[PDB]
Design a protein around this motif. Structure first.
Motif, PDB file in Angstrom:
ATOM      1  N   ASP A  18       0.865  -1.017   0.091  1.00  0.00           N
ATOM      2  CA  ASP A  18      -0.142   0.086   0.137  1.00  0.00           C
ATOM      3  C   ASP A  18       1.020   1.245   0.031  1.00  0.00           C
ATOM      4  N   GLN A  19       0.691   2.078  -1.111  1.00  0.00           N
ATOM      5  CA  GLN A  19       1.483   3.305  -1.242  1.00  0.00           C
ATOM      6  C   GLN A  19       0.914   4.634  -0.208  1.00  0.00           C
ATOM      7  N   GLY A  20      -0.158   4.415  -0.128  1.00  0.00           N
ATOM      8  CA  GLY A  20      -1.158   5.369   0.698  1.00  0.00           C
ATOM      9  C   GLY A  20      -0.940   6.585  -0.373  1.00  0.00           C
ATOM     10  N   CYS A  22       0.880   8.713  -0.887  1.00  0.00           N
ATOM     11  CA  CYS A  22       2.226   9.286  -1.364  1.00  0.00           C
ATOM     12  C   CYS A  22       2.249   8.620  -2.801  1.00  0.00           C
ATOM     13  N   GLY A  23       2.657   9.654  -3.683  1.00  0.00           N
ATOM     14  CA  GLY A  23       2.851   9.133  -5.092  1.00  0.00           C
ATOM     15  C   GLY A  23       4.252   8.475  -5.579  1.00  0.00           C
ATOM     16  N   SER A  24       4.316   7.555  -4.637  1.00  0.00           N
ATOM     17  CA  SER A  24       5.557   6.709  -4.804  1.00  0.00           C
ATOM     18  C   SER A  24       5.294   5.281  -5.721  1.00  0.00           C
ATOM     19  N   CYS A  25       4.447   5.452  -6.528  1.00  0.00           N
ATOM     20  CA  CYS A  25       4.234   4.174  -7.545  1.00  0.00           C
ATOM     21  C   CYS A  25       5.684   3.680  -8.135  1.00  0.00           C
ATOM     22  N   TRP A  26       6.508   4.554  -8.450  1.00  0.00           N
ATOM     23  CA  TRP A  26       7.686   4.280  -9.145  1.00  0.00           C
ATOM     24  C   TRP A  26       8.772   3.514  -8.228  1.00  0.00           C
ATOM     25  N   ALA A  27       8.519   3.785  -6.916  1.00  0.00           N
ATOM     26  CA  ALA A  27       9.359   2.951  -6.020  1.00  0.00           C
ATOM     27  C   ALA A  27       8.939   1.753  -5.629  1.00  0.00           C
ATOM     28  N   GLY A  62      10.368  11.572  -4.443  1.00  0.00           N
ATOM     29  CA  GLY A  62       9.456  10.998  -3.481  1.00  0.00           C
ATOM     30  C   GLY A  62       8.090  11.012  -3.627  1.00  0.00           C
ATOM     31  N   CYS A  63       7.395  11.718  -3.069  1.00  0.00           N
ATOM     32  CA  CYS A  63       5.985  11.382  -3.180  1.00  0.00           C
ATOM     33  C   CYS A  63       5.222  12.210  -3.894  1.00  0.00           C
ATOM     34  N   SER A  64       6.189  12.982  -4.877  1.00  0.00           N
ATOM     35  CA  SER A  64       5.832  13.736  -6.196  1.00  0.00           C
ATOM     36  C   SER A  64       6.236  12.952  -7.428  1.00  0.00           C
ATOM     37  N   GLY A  65       6.531  11.674  -7.373  1.00  0.00           N
ATOM     38  CA  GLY A  65       6.940  10.923  -8.456  1.00  0.00           C
ATOM     39  C   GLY A  65       8.655  10.727  -8.777  1.00  0.00           C
ATOM     40  N   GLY A  66       8.721   9.983  -9.648  1.00  0.00           N
ATOM     41  CA  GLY A  66       9.870   9.452 -10.009  1.00  0.00           C
ATOM     42  C   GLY A  66      10.034   8.430 -11.299  1.00  0.00           C
ATOM     43  N   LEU A  67      11.080   8.094 -11.508  1.00  0.00           N
ATOM     44  CA  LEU A  67      11.312   7.003 -12.498  1.00  0.00           C
ATOM     45  C   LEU A  67      12.051   5.786 -12.035  1.00  0.00           C
ATOM     46  N   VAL A 137       7.190  -1.745 -15.341  1.00  0.00           N
ATOM     47  CA  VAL A 137       6.616  -0.869 -16.526  1.00  0.00           C
ATOM     48  C   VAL A 137       5.766   0.334 -16.167  1.00  0.00           C
ATOM     49  N   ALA A 138       5.583   1.245 -16.994  1.00  0.00           N
ATOM     50  CA  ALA A 138       4.823   2.387 -16.862  1.00  0.00           C
ATOM     51  C   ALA A 138       3.771   2.390 -17.544  1.00  0.00           C
ATOM     52  N   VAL A 139       2.508   2.779 -17.222  1.00  0.00           N
ATOM     53  CA  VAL A 139       1.430   2.655 -17.926  1.00  0.00           C
ATOM     54  C   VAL A 139       0.523   4.039 -17.665  1.00  0.00           C
ATOM     55  N   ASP A 140      -0.468   3.947 -18.178  1.00  0.00           N
ATOM     56  CA  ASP A 140      -1.487   5.272 -18.133  1.00  0.00           C
ATOM     57  C   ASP A 140      -2.596   4.659 -17.478  1.00  0.00           C
ATOM     58  N   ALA A 141      -2.710   4.897 -16.190  1.00  0.00           N
ATOM     59  CA  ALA A 141      -3.409   4.360 -15.279  1.00  0.00           C
ATOM     60  C   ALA A 141      -4.775   5.259 -14.756  1.00  0.00           C
ATOM     61  N   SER A 142      -5.107   6.129 -15.803  1.00  0.00           N
ATOM     62  CA  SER A 142      -6.215   7.303 -15.634  1.00  0.00           C
ATOM     63  C   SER A 142      -7.448   6.362 -15.521  1.00  0.00           C
ATOM     64  N   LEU A 160       1.672   8.384 -19.718  1.00  0.00           N
ATOM     65  CA  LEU A 160       2.464   7.627 -18.735  1.00  0.00           C
ATOM     66  C   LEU A 160       2.293   8.525 -17.297  1.00  0.00           C
ATOM     67  N   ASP A 161       1.776   7.859 -16.433  1.00  0.00           N
ATOM     68  CA  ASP A 161       1.505   8.428 -15.041  1.00  0.00           C
ATOM     69  C   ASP A 161       1.664   7.471 -13.958  1.00  0.00           C
ATOM     70  N   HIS A 162       2.006   6.342 -14.160  1.00  0.00           N
ATOM     71  CA  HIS A 162       2.078   5.228 -13.096  1.00  0.00           C
ATOM     72  C   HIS A 162       3.181   4.193 -13.307  1.00  0.00           C
ATOM     73  N   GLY A 163       3.704   3.659 -12.275  1.00  0.00           N
ATOM     74  CA  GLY A 163       4.387   2.621 -12.257  1.00  0.00           C
ATOM     75  C   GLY A 163       4.042   1.301 -11.725  1.00  0.00           C
ATOM     76  N   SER A 183      -0.096  -1.252  -6.573  1.00  0.00           N
ATOM     77  CA  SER A 183       0.297  -1.146  -5.226  1.00  0.00           C
ATOM     78  C   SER A 183      -0.690  -0.188  -4.169  1.00  0.00           C
ATOM     79  N   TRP A 184      -1.906  -0.577  -4.575  1.00  0.00           N
ATOM     80  CA  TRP A 184      -3.028   0.111  -3.926  1.00  0.00           C
ATOM     81  C   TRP A 184      -4.044  -0.859  -3.026  1.00  0.00           C
ATOM     82  N   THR A 185      -3.264  -1.507  -2.237  1.00  0.00           N
ATOM     83  CA  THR A 185      -3.799  -2.696  -1.435  1.00  0.00           C
ATOM     84  C   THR A 185      -4.569  -3.824  -2.276  1.00  0.00           C
TER      85      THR A 185
HETATM   86  C1  LIG Z   1       2.600   7.327  -8.944  1.00  0.00           C
HETATM   87  C2  LIG Z   1       1.282   7.505  -9.428  1.00  0.00           C
HETATM   88  S1  LIG Z   1      -0.129   7.007  -8.574  1.00  0.00           S
HETATM   89  O1  LIG Z   1      -0.334   5.678  -8.018  1.00  0.00           O
HETATM   90  O2  LIG Z   1      -0.164   8.024  -7.685  1.00  0.00           O
HETATM   91  C3  LIG Z   1      -1.491   7.151  -9.871  1.00  0.00           C
HETATM   92  C4  LIG Z   1      -2.281   8.496  -9.594  1.00  0.00           C
HETATM   93  C5  LIG Z   1      -3.580   8.775 -10.210  1.00  0.00           C
HETATM   94  C6  LIG Z   1      -3.848   7.765 -11.236  1.00  0.00           C
HETATM   95  C7  LIG Z   1      -2.835   6.561 -11.609  1.00  0.00           C
HETATM   96  C8  LIG Z   1      -1.759   6.378 -10.872  1.00  0.00           C
HETATM   97  C9  LIG Z   1       3.318   8.503  -9.419  1.00  0.00           C
HETATM   98  C10 LIG Z   1       2.555   9.967  -9.089  1.00  0.00           C
HETATM   99  C11 LIG Z   1       3.504  11.201  -9.107  1.00  0.00           C
HETATM  100  C12 LIG Z   1       2.499  12.113  -8.797  1.00  0.00           C
HETATM  101  C13 LIG Z   1       2.191  12.674  -7.590  1.00  0.00           C
HETATM  102  C14 LIG Z   1       1.491  13.583  -7.020  1.00  0.00           C
HETATM  103  C15 LIG Z   1       0.785  14.380  -7.999  1.00  0.00           C
HETATM  104  C16 LIG Z   1       0.708  13.849  -9.431  1.00  0.00           C
HETATM  105  C17 LIG Z   1       1.675  13.021  -9.659  1.00  0.00           C
HETATM  106  N1  LIG Z   1       3.903   8.587 -10.796  1.00  0.00           N
HETATM  107  C18 LIG Z   1       4.977   8.570 -11.075  1.00  0.00           C
HETATM  108  O3  LIG Z   1       5.973   8.655 -10.279  1.00  0.00           O
HETATM  109  C19 LIG Z   1       5.315   8.538 -12.466  1.00  0.00           C
HETATM  110  C20 LIG Z   1       5.620   7.285 -12.774  1.00  0.00           C
HETATM  111  C21 LIG Z   1       6.299   7.079 -14.054  1.00  0.00           C
HETATM  112  C22 LIG Z   1       7.390   6.238 -14.489  1.00  0.00           C
HETATM  113  C23 LIG Z   1       8.094   6.111 -15.734  1.00  0.00           C
HETATM  114  C24 LIG Z   1       7.448   7.060 -16.906  1.00  0.00           C
HETATM  115  C25 LIG Z   1       6.312   7.753 -16.764  1.00  0.00           C
HETATM  116  C26 LIG Z   1       5.871   7.758 -14.977  1.00  0.00           C
HETATM  117  N2  LIG Z   1       6.326   9.520 -12.699  1.00  0.00           N
HETATM  118  C27 LIG Z   1       6.146  10.794 -12.511  1.00  0.00           C
HETATM  119  O4  LIG Z   1       4.804  11.159 -12.174  1.00  0.00           O
HETATM  120  N3  LIG Z   1       7.249  11.872 -12.448  1.00  0.00           N
HETATM  121  C28 LIG Z   1       8.344  11.301 -13.534  1.00  0.00           C
HETATM  122  C29 LIG Z   1       9.535  12.259 -12.761  1.00  0.00           C
HETATM  123  O5  LIG Z   1       9.284  13.589 -12.698  1.00  0.00           O
HETATM  124  C30 LIG Z   1       7.970  13.921 -11.926  1.00  0.00           C
HETATM  125  C31 LIG Z   1       6.765  13.167 -12.440  1.00  0.00           C
END
Ligand SMILES: *[C@H](CS(=O)(=O)c1ccccc1)[C@H](CCc1ccccc1)NC(=O)[C@H](Cc1ccccc1)NC(=O)N1CCOCC1
Length: 215
Positions: A18-20, A22-27, A62-67, A137-142, A160-163, A183-185
């Motif tokens: 569970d990532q809670g 925090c936008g740590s899906c990449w981790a 961190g919680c703002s995302g990563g790769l 893998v990274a995907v569009d999880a909208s 792409l917005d989710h790992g 990673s959402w429980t």
């Molecule tokens: C994780 C996404 S999630 O599980 O929160 C989610 C949210 C809504 C729908 C579907 C999934 C994470 C969220 C980052 C974030 C945090 C706060 C507000 C907006 C966004 N997504 C990432 O970390 C993505 C992962 C990724 C990996 C490889 C290619 C493309 C995406 N990375 C990403 O958001 N960032 C890349 C680095 O720069 C910052 C943005």
């Protein structure tokens, strides 16, 4: 090559986490991959630390995302290839805030030497996964927020917005699909997993695949 492969069946995948808030899906995508690769290298299945990356990986946000690729590189270049165990560096970012990085009081659970980036081809990714294991893998999880079960035959594939982690596939079913660990429980989807149609680049699944390299 095989018609169907499910790495969970070989005991190569840890429980759904569970990532809670925090936008740590990449981790979770990166660590989940290392967990599987470590087991497949001939070591006992060990839960590794996502927190280590969220707090210490400064090449990411961190919680703002990563790769996932940045995370793999950080482990190797900045942390001597070391990945701590989850019990020695527990997850504490569920509230949306990541605590400062602590460089001691942790136990090394696994080590990696680098990472490889797979081709943007589902058939080629499947062939690699069938032999070498789960892929990050990274995907569009909208479209994923409303998912409740079954094979998703239609997915918004724009950005792409989710790992996540690919743990298997099945080409024998009515509609071939990919098995993905989220990673959402375990309350979300099929006990934490989701199945999407395979072959038509659903959710842009072939665009950014990669895996850590052990030993
Ligand atoms: C994780 C996404 S999630 O599980 O929160 C989610 C949210 C809504 C729908 C579907 C999934 C994470 C969220 C980052 C974030 C945090 C706060 C507000 C907006 C966004 N997504 C990432 O970390 C993505 C992962 C990724 C990996 C490889 C290619 C493309 C995406 N990375 C990403 O958001 N960032 C890349 C680095 O720069 C910052 C943005």
């Amino acid at each position: 090559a095989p018609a169907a492969v499910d790495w969970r069946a070989r005991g190569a995948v840890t429980a759904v986490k569970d990532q809670g808030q925090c936008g740590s899906c990449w981790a979770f995508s990166a660590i989940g991959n290392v967990e599987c690769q470590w087991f497949l290298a001939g070591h006992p299945l060990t839960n590794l630390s996502e927190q280590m990356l969220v707090s210490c990986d400064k090449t990411d946000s961190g919680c703002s995302g990563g790769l996932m690729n940045n995370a793999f590189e950080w482990i190797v270049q900045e942390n001597n290839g070391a990945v701590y165990t989850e019990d020695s560096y527990p997850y504490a970012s569920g509230e949306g805030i990541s605590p400062p990085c602590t460089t001691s009081g942790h136990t090394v659970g696994a080590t990696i030497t680098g990472h490889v980036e797979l081709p943007q081809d589902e058939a080629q990714i499947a062939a690699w996964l069938a032999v070498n294991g789960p892929v990050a893998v990274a995907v569009d999880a909208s479209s994923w927020m409303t998912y409740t079960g079954g094979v998703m035959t239609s997915c918004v594939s724009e950005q792409l917005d989710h790992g996540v982690l690919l743990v298997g596939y099945n080409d024998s079913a009515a509609v071939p699909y990919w098995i993905i660990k989220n990673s959402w429980t375990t309350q979300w989807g099929e006990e934490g997993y989701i199945r999407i149609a395979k072959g038509s680049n659903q959710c842009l699944v072939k665009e950014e695949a990669s895996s850590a390299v052990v030993g």
